[PDB]
């Protein structure tokens, strides 16, 4: 009743195996309070800024950047929709063509935080000059505690 | 140079992010669909704390 | 037929005031090209420097 | 002379990344210190 609860606590005091089993039960119950897995998902476009302010670079500046954590193995799947394009970031040593129907993978890991610029490096029309690339790199704890909370529905 | 070529695949770790890059005329598109899960950080200290909370 | 507005002298003076500093929308700003401008590895950006 | 300049630049890069690791080891020690402080608070929270 209540003494049997107290007798259970006395058996916790006495038997080490029962103590370990109830510790494992405590660990099972604490994992039940852990929130479940949630999906992170986004789909945005990145366009060149037509007019820039001081502190921004003409031709190379976009409106929406790609935010990537540092010290993390990142897979980049590159493809296209209509013609050939090339995703080139010269500071990160990645330049791989975007082919319609292909899914070209890149393994990338960034050493330091910063803002890295790029352009498209495959001729694709009249406005080939005006498809720039900007990658913003932040720390992994910021990425996993603040940035991914912007994409929880 | 051959050694640098064969080092371009670096899949010897647990991958942490996937980003789908799509090239259009004339702009870029970025996609992601992953899952965020949480894990109790060093639970055995909490296990012992609960153990000494229940023993008295 | 088109001389861009980032080459005018007012833009050039306001850019020279900022320097080679890139803003970030999720983090404090960062110095661009930290090796050729010899920023030390303890300093990441101007706002995070906070000079003594 | 060219390889001397290259080795000089690589030396600066190695010192840069060493300083960055020295800095990055400092916040993560203070983070675990704050975690231990919260653990010491939760310890007396279940004993009072």
């Amino acid at each position: 009743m209540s003494e049997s609860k107290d007798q259970l606590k006395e058996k916790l005091k006495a038997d080490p195996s029962f103590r370990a089993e109830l510790k494992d039960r405590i660990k099972n119950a604490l994992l039940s309070k852990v929130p479940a897995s949630v999906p992170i998902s986004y789909n945005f476009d990145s366009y060149m800024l037509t007019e820039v302010q001081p502190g921004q670079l003409r031709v190379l500046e976009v409106d929406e950047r790609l935010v990537l954590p540092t010290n993390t193995l990142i897979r980049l799947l590159v493809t296209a929709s209509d013609v050939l394009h090339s995703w080139a970031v010269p500071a990160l040593g990645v330049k791989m063509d975007a082919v319609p129907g292909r899914l070209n993978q890149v393994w990338m890991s960034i050493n330091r935080e910063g803002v890295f610029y790029g352009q498209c490096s495959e001729l694709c029309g009249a406005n080939h000059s005006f498809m720039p690339i900007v990658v913003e790199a932040i720390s992994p704890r910021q990425f996993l505690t603040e940035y991914v909370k912007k994409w929880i529905s | 140079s051959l050694t640098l070529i064969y080092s371009l695949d670096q899949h010897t770790e647990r991958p942490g992010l996937t980003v789908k890059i799509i090239g259009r005329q004339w702009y870029w598109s970025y996609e992601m669909h992953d899952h965020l899960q949480h894990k109790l950080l060093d639970p055995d200290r909490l296990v012992g704390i609960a153990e000494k909370a229940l023993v008295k | 037929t088109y001389r861009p507005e980032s080459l005018s002298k007012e833009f050039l003076e306001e850019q020279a005031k900022i320097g080679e500093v890139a803003q970030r929308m999720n983090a404090p700003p960062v110095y661009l090209n930290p090796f050729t401008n010899r920023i030390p590895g303890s300093i990441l950006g101007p706002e995070d420097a906070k000079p003594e | 002379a060219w390889k001397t300049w290259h080795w000089n630049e690589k030396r600066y890069i190695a010192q840069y990344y060493a300083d960055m690791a020295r800095r990055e080891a400092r916040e993560d020690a203070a983070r675990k210190s704050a975690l231990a402080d919260k653990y010491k608070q939760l310890e007396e929270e279940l004993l009072s």
Binding site: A91, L92, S109, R112, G114 | - | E20, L32, N33, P34 | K10
Partner: peptide
């Protein structure tokens, strides 16, 4: 990270692979 006026060589790097490429180029 970004190109600079009157620049001769490559840009600065943030991956070990890009640094290794520049090292190979200087060796050649």
């Amino acid at each position: 990270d970004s190109p600079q006026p009157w620049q001769l060589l490559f840009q600065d790097t943030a991956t070990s692979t890009a640094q290794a490429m520049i090292d190979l180029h200087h060796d050649i």
